[PDB]
C-alpha cells in the first residue's frame, strides 16, 4: 500500500537514497584526490 500511494502522489521513495549514494562516490573522488596530496607531501608538511 505504501508503494501505490507513492505512485499516486508521484513521490520518489528513494530520491534521498539515490542522491545519498551519488554524493558518497562524489566525496570518495575528492578523498582520492586529497590523499594524493598527503601521500606525496606528508603529514608534517600538510599539517
Amino acid at each position: 500500500q505504501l508503494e501505490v500511494l507513492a505512485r499516486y502522489l508521484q513521490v520518489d521513495l528513494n530520491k534521498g537514497a539515490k542522491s545519498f549514494i551519488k554524493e558518497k562516490e562524489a566525496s570518495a573522488v575528492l578523498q582520492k584526490e586529497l590523499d594524493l596530496w598527503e601521500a606525496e607531501h606528508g603529514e608534517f608538511y600538510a599539517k
Binding site: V4, L5, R7, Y8
Partner: peptide
C-alpha cells in the same frame, strides 16, 4: 401566408475526467 398557415398548424419552416481517471487508477491498484 404560409407563415400564418405554418403557425396556425404549428409546424413552421476537460481535465475533470483526467482527474477522474487517476482516482479510479488508485482504486484499481
Amino acid at each position: 401566408i404560409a407563415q400564418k398557415y405554418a403557425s396556425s398548424a404549428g409546424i413552421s419552416l476537460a481535465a475533470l475526467d483526467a482527474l477522474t481517471a487517476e482516482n479510479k487508477k488508485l482504486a484499481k491498484q
